[PDB]
Swiss-Prot record, chain A:
It is found in: Cytoplasm, Cytosol. Cytosolic enzyme that catalyzes the carboxylation of acetyl-CoA to malonyl-CoA, the first and rate-limiting step of de novo fatty acid biosynthesis. This is a 2 steps reaction starting with the ATP-dependent carboxylation of the biotin carried by the biotin carboxyl carrier (BCC) domain followed by the transfer of the carboxyl group from carboxylated biotin to acetyl-CoA. The chain holds residues 2270 to 2337 of 2346 of the full protein. Consists of an N-terminal biotin carboxylation/carboxylase (BC) domain that catalyzes the ATP-dependent transient carboxylation of the biotin covalently attached to the central biotinyl-binding/biotin carboxyl carrier (BCC) domain. The C-terminal carboxyl transferase (CT) domain catalyzes the transfer of the carboxyl group from carboxylated biotin to acetyl-CoA to produce malonyl-CoA. It is linked to Acetyl-CoA carboxylase-alpha deficiency: An autosomal recessive inborn error of de novo fatty acid synthesis associated with severe brain damage, persistent myopathy and poor growth. Expressed in brain, placenta, skeletal muscle, renal, pancreatic and adipose tissues; expressed at low level in pulmonary tissue; not detected in the liver. This is Acetyl-CoA carboxylase 1. It comes from Homo sapiens (Human). It comes from the Eukaryota. Monomer, homodimer, and homotetramer. Can form filamentous polymers. Interacts in its inactive phosphorylated form with the BRCT domains of BRCA1 which prevents ACACA dephosphorylation and inhibits lipid synthesis. Interacts with MID1IP1; interaction with MID1IP1 promotes oligomerization and increases its activity. The biotin cofactor is covalently attached to the central biotinyl-binding domain and is required for the catalytic activity.
Length: 68, 78
């Protein structure tokens, strides 16, 4: 099992960066929860948080936000 | 009688120039220029840099005054 664990971290730019992708997803989820909790404690921040967030994002994404 | 007119114009110049986020710049330029001496350069290079790139970064979508930053610098060498 040791050998297995090392290759996921150790073998660069393979089909082994599985755990890496999963963790990225995990980071995103926890971060998202931080945003949710943070806004609940501080709901006033929402509007301004977006403007900062929106300063670069795709034009297509701009369309999706206005339609929805 | 002119007051009821006069204040209306006056009030728009205030509010309008108060929304204009070039105010902190114009007052921090003008004040930090007029107390330019008696000056410790750590605090001068800090103030003069950051007034300058409040000026550069004005008209950004996400521009707020770096209050905590200036205060903190003052805070540590205080």
């Amino acid at each position: 099992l040791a050998e297995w664990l090392e290759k996921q971290l150790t073998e660069e730019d393979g089909v082994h960066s599985v755990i890496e992708e999963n963790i990225k997803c995990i980071s995103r989820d926890y971060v998202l929860k931080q945003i949710r909790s943070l806004v609940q404690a501080n709901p006033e921040v929402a509007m301004d948080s977006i403007i900062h967030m929106t300063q670069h994002i795709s034009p297509t994404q701009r369309a999706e936000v206005i339609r929805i | 009688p002119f007051f009821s007119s006069k204040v209306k114009d006056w009030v728009e110049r205030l509010m309008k120039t108060l929304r204009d986020p070039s105010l902190p710049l114009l007052e921090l330029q003008d004040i930090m220029t007029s107390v330019s001496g008696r000056i410790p350069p750590n605090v001068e290079k800090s103030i003069k840099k950051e007034m300058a790139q409040y000026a550069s970064n004005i008209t950004s979508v996400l521009c707020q005054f770096p209050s905590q930053q200036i205060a903190n610098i003052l805070d540590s060498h205080a």
